[PDB]
Design an enzyme around this catalytic site. Structure first.
Site, PDB file in Angstrom:
ATOM      1  N   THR C  13      28.447 -14.980  23.893  1.00 20.54           N
ATOM      2  CA  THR C  13      27.538 -14.549  24.947  1.00 20.54           C
ATOM      3  C   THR C  13      27.056 -15.851  25.560  1.00 20.54           C
ATOM      4  O   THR C  13      26.760 -16.742  24.748  1.00 20.54           O
ATOM      5  CB  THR C  13      26.574 -13.572  24.228  1.00 20.54           C
ATOM      6  N   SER C  51      37.075 -20.838  23.032  1.00 17.11           N
ATOM      7  CA  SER C  51      37.964 -21.176  24.155  1.00 17.11           C
ATOM      8  C   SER C  51      38.948 -22.246  23.669  1.00 17.11           C
ATOM      9  O   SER C  51      40.015 -22.311  24.221  1.00 17.11           O
ATOM     10  CB  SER C  51      37.214 -21.668  25.356  1.00 17.11           C
ATOM     11  N   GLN C  52      38.519 -23.111  22.779  1.00 20.14           N
ATOM     12  CA  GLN C  52      39.411 -24.206  22.247  1.00 20.14           C
ATOM     13  C   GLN C  52      40.638 -23.612  21.582  1.00 20.14           C
ATOM     14  O   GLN C  52      41.614 -24.321  21.460  1.00 20.14           O
ATOM     15  CB  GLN C  52      38.793 -25.203  21.287  1.00 20.14           C
ATOM     16  N   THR C  82      34.120 -22.929  28.245  1.00 17.51           N
ATOM     17  CA  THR C  82      34.349 -23.956  29.291  1.00 17.51           C
ATOM     18  C   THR C  82      35.546 -24.829  29.006  1.00 17.51           C
ATOM     19  O   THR C  82      36.021 -25.443  29.985  1.00 17.51           O
ATOM     20  CB  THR C  82      33.145 -24.887  29.426  1.00 17.51           C
TER      21      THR C  82
END
Lengths: 319, 311, 319, 311
Positions: C13, C51-52, C82
Site C-alpha cells: 500500500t 517491485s525488485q 518504484t
C-alpha cells in the site's frame, strides 16, 4: 535536387579560404562550405543589431518577410544573438503563417574563438530547415544538436554552449549525423492556427515587465501606469505572487483597463490561474508556463485582438 | 541529553509555534524544541525590517540555544537565507525551512522538512557552513540556494555549486562547504542599523522601457540591480539610464535573468568605463542583498566589486 | 456521475478511521477517502510482490487483465514499487490494447512515514485516469504532480520523491488542483498501434543485460550465451561502445543467432545505429533512447515476432 | 616564467602529442607544454594495466613538472579519474580532458577543452583538490564526475555534489572542494602492484538471471558490484547468489543503476546479516574502482564499508 533554404541574418556572423565582404551573411555561408552538401543556401541580411537591443520593429519586419517570401523558398534559418532568441522565436511562433520550417540559430562562443559552436549549430539549423518532418511544428530553435519549440525554449546558463532548453516540456527531437528523430510536437496553437495577423501592423501594444523581490518598490509599476502602457507583466515570486506595494499598483491599473499578467521569476513551472492570487477579483491573467519575457510577447499580440481580461486569459490558455 | 533547538517562525505554521512538538511528535526524539513567533507575514511581503529583526534576534540569542530553525514561506526564502548568511555572527547552525504544500493538504511536505531541519540544526557537523536551507532531504548553502519550480516539493536547489549534504534516516553525509565568506567572516554588522540602503531591480527584454530604471534614479535609490539578458547585457535604453545613474550616486550591479551562471566582470559590458559591478553567480534578488550591505560600507564601485568577488 | 476507475495493486500500500483488512488495495482506498470526490474506485489485488522481484509472469498477467477488463471500467490505476515501475510501464505501453487511460503510480516514502508522498500521488493517478484527455497517450506513470509517458519515464535518484522524469523528451503534462494541461504526446507507436499480442503467451523470450566498464569480464555475456538466451542487451559505455572481450562474445553470439542490442549505461541520449559500432557488420541492433532495462522489454517482444537483426532494428526505430 | 605542464595522452589526439602546441597555438601563452604518449587504446578498452601505468608515471614524474593534463576518451574517463584520484600521491594538479566530437569534425570541442585543462593544471588554486576532470568550461572532482548524455559536449557533470569552479576567460572561480579523502590522504599505494583484485559488475532488472553473478563466483572473483534497482535492491535470484558469494570469499558492494543518489547502508537490504557493503553515491563503475583498491588492503566487509564511508 537539394532544398532551397534562405538564411535571414539579424546581426553578426556565428561562423568565420574566402575574401571577406561588406555583408555578414555572405561571409557566414563561405565560412560553412559543408552547407552545400545539404541545401541551396541564399542569405539576406535583414538587419544588423545586437540581440540585447532586439525590438518590436525587427519582429514585425521578420514575420512580414517570412510570410511574403514563403512561396520563394523551402525553409528559413534566422541567425540571431542568444540573449533574446527565446523572445523572437515565440513572437514568430505566433505570427508566421508560412507552413515551411522556420529555424532560429545562434552561438554562445565568438566565431573566432577556439571550439566555436556557431559553424555546426548553423549546419544543424539547415539540416532541420531542410527536413520535411520539421514542417507544422511551429517556429524552432536549433542549438547544441537539439530541436526546440519556440514557446518552451529558454537560455538556462549565462555561457554554456548547451544553455538552450525547453525547461518544462522537453525538446522536439535530437540531431545525429544530419538526421532528426522527432518524438514530440507542441500541442499549444502556433503559426497558421493563431488569430494574430501582423501583416498591416506598424507597431505593437506597449507592455513592460516589473520584477518582484523582498521590499520591492512600486515605482517601476507606477512609471509604466503613468506612461499609459497597454499592459504589464509581473515577474512574480513562487507561483506568481506579488509584493504588497507592487500588488496594489497593478490592482488599481487593472481597474483603469491596463492588462496585467502574473508570470514568475521562477525559471520552470506554470503560474496557475486563481491559485495564489484571486485573478477573478483583480482582473488579472495567469501566464501559465510562459516566463515574463514570453508572457510579454503573447500579451502584446492579445492586445491587438482585445483588452478584455477574460478574453486575454483564454488566449493565455490556448497559445 | 538532546540539543536545545529554537524554532523562529516568520508566518503560518508549516505542520502555533509552541504546538510544533505535538504536530511532529518525532522532534521529541532528536531535540528539546522551543518555538518563538518573531513576525507573522506572507513571504511574498518579506522586507528589510523583518531581515533586521531576524539577524538581531539570532545574534542576541546565540548563547541561549544550540541551534536555530527558521520557518519561512518559499517565495523569498532564498533572499532571507543569503541576507542572514551575510549578517549572522552566531556560529551555531541557522537552518531555514518551509513547505511547497499547505500543512492541511494531502502528503504535506512541512512535517518531514521541519524534522529534517531540526536534524540539520542539531548536527555538530552543520556548524561553520554558513546559513543553510533544508528542503526535500537536502542541505543547501544560503548563497547558491534558489527555487527552480513554481510548485514542485523538490524546487530548492543550489543550481551553480550543488548541495552540501543529503539527509538519510536522520543522518547527514556532508561532502561540501561554501568557499565564499559568510557569517563571522564578513564585515557586514547590522546590530545598530534600523534601515537598509535602497536597492531596486529592473528587468531586461526586447524593447525594454527605460521608465523603471529612471523611476528608481529620480527616487534617489542607492543601488540598481539589472536583471540582464544573457551574461548581464542591457537593452540600449536601459543601459543609457544606468550609465547616467552610476556617474550620479547610484551603484549599478549587472546580474542576469538567466537562472544559472555568472555575470562576469568586463566580458559583455565595459564595467570599468561605466562604473558598473558584475554580480557573478548572484541572481538579481541575491545581488540586491549583497549590494544593500555593500552600500552600508562603501559607495565606491571598485570596492563594491571587491565585495562581489569575496562574499 | 463520476468515472469508474479500477486500481490493480501489485504489492503493498502507498497510503495508510477504518478497520485494516487482509487485502492491501482495500486498506489503500480507505486511506484516501478524497478519491470519492473524483471516481467510483474498485480495487483488485492482482499480485503481492516487491517491485525488485518484478518478472515476466506479472507482466503477462497485468496486460491480459487490462485487455480482458477494458469494457468493465473507464480507466486503470496500477500501484507498483518504484524500483522497476519504468520497465512494467513500457511493457504495458507495448501490449495493452485498451483505449482508456492506464496509469501507474508508486511512492518513494513509506505510507507510515512523515510527509508520505503515496496518498496525493494516488489521488493524482486517479485524476489522470479519469481525465478524458488522458486517452490515446499510451501507458502513463503519474508521480510528483507530473504525467509521464511509459517509454521515456525513468527513476533519476535513489530516494527523491521527484525521482521520476522523462529524461530525454520531457513530461506529457503537469497536474495542478486536479486539472492537467497536456502539451505533448509520445510520437513512438504504442498500445493498439503495436503488433505485440501477449493474449495467448505463457512466457517471454529470455533476454539478459550485461554491463560495460574498464577491464569488463566476458564471463557474464558467455554465461547468457551458454544458457541459449534469445537475446542480450549491452549496457554500453558512452554511445553504446563495448569493452573488447564483451564485444567479442556478443559478436560470436550474433553469428549463432542471439539478438544483441547495444544500449548505454549513460542515463540520457540515444545509442545511435552504425555510429560508434558497425552494427551492419556484426548483426547488432542500436537501442536508441531506450536504456538497457527498457531495451530488454522491447527486445523480448521483438523476438515474439522475429529473430532477424534488420527486422529487430526497424522495431527499435518505430516503438 | 610560465608553468611546466606535462600532457600524458592515452589515445588519439584531441586537437601527435608533441604537435599539440602547434594544434592549439594559444597554449604557448599559458604554459610550457611537453607531450608524452603513455599508451594508445580506445577508452572503451580501458583496463587495470593502463591505470597502474598512469598512477606510477605521475607519482614518479611529480618532481619533473608543475602540473599534468591527461587526454582520455570520454566512455570511461570517470573510472580513470576516480582510480587516479585514489592512487595519485603528487599534490600538483592532475587534470583529465577529452572531447565529445572528433578533432577533424565541425565545431570540435577538444581544442578549447585542452586549453581549459591546461589553464586548470597551471592554476595554483587547483592544488590539493584531488584528481580533476575539466570539460565544457567546468572543473569537476574525479569522485562525483560522470557522463550524463551519449553525445552532448556538456555531458560531464558532478551529478550529486556539483562542480568545483567554472572557467571564464582563462580564470577559475573555485567555490568548492571534495570533502572525501583523496590522493595523499588515502592508504592506497599502487607503486609495487602489477595486477588489481578481480571485481566484476552485474545489472538488476525485472526477471534478472543469476547467471552473470554466478559466472563471477565460479571464476573466484574477489568482488562483485551490484547495479541494483532503486536504493541498491536486488532481484531475488541475484540476491540469493550474492548472499552465497559474501559468505564464501567475494566482497559484495550494493550500488544502483539509478544515475544519482546514494545506496545507503542497512536501509533497503540487511547488509550486516548478509556481509554486504553499501556504495553510497559511487555508481557501479566507480564502486568497482574503490572495491578493487579496498581489496588490496582488506577482505573484511566491516573494514571495506569503513573505506566506502571515507573515500
Amino acid at each position: 535536387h537539394l532544398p532551397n533554404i534562405t538564411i535571414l541574418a539579424t546581426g553578426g556572423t556565428i561562423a568565420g579560404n574566402y575574401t571577406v565582404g561588406k555583408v555578414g551573411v555572405e561571409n557566414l555561408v563561405n565560412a560553412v562550405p559543408q552547407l552545400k552538401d545539404i541545401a541551396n543556401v541564399k542569405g539576406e541580411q535583414v538587419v544588423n543589431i545586437g540581440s540585447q537591443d532586439m525590438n518590436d520593429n525587427v519582429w514585425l519586419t521578420l514575420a512580414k518577410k517570412i510570410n511574403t517570401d514563403c512561396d520563394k523558398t523551402d525553409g528559413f534559418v534566422i541567425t540571431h544573438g542568444t540573449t533574446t532568441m527565446e523572445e523572437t522565436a515565440y513572437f514568430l511562433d505566433l505570427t508566421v503563417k508560412c507552413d515551411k520550417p522556420v529555424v532560429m540559430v545562434g552561438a554562445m562562443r565568438p566565431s573566432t574563438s577556439m571550439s566555436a559552436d556557431g559553424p555546426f549549430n548553423l549546419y544543424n539549423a539547415v539540416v532541420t530547415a531542410a527536413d520535411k518532418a520539421s514542417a507544422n511544428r511551429g517556429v524552432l530553435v536549433v542549438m547544441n544538436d537539439t530541436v526546440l519549440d519556440g514557446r518552451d525554449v529558454t537560455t538556462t546558463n549565462t555561457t554554456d554552449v548547451a544553455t538552450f532548453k525547453s525547461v518544462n516540456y522537453g525538446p522536439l527531437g535530437y540531431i545525429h549525423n544530419g538526421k532528426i528523430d522527432y518524438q514530440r510536437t507542441p500541442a499549444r496553437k502556433h503559426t497558421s492556427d493563431t488569430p494574430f495577423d501582423v501583416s498591416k501592423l506598424n507597431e505593437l501594444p506597449k507592455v513592460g515587465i516589473v520584477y518582484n523581490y523582498a521590499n520591492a518598490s512600486d515605482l517601476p509599476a507606477k512609471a509604466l501606469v503613468d506612461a499609459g502602457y497597454d499592459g504589464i507583466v509581473s515577474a512574480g515570486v513562487g507561483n506568481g505572487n506579488l509584493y504588497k506595494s507592487v500588488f496594489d499598483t497593478l490592482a488599481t491599473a487593472a481597474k483603469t483597463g491596463t492588462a496585467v499578467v502574473r508570470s514568475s521569476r521562477v525559471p520552470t513551472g506554470a503560474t496557475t490561474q486563481d491559485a495564489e492570487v484571486d485573478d477573478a477579483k483583480y482582473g488579472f491573467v495567469a501566464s501559465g508556463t510562459l516566463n515574463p519575457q514570453k508572457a510579454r510577447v503573447l500579451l502584446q499580440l492579445a492586445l491587438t485582438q482585445t483588452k478584455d481580461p477574460q478574453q486575454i486569459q483564454q488566449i493565455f490558455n490556448q497559445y
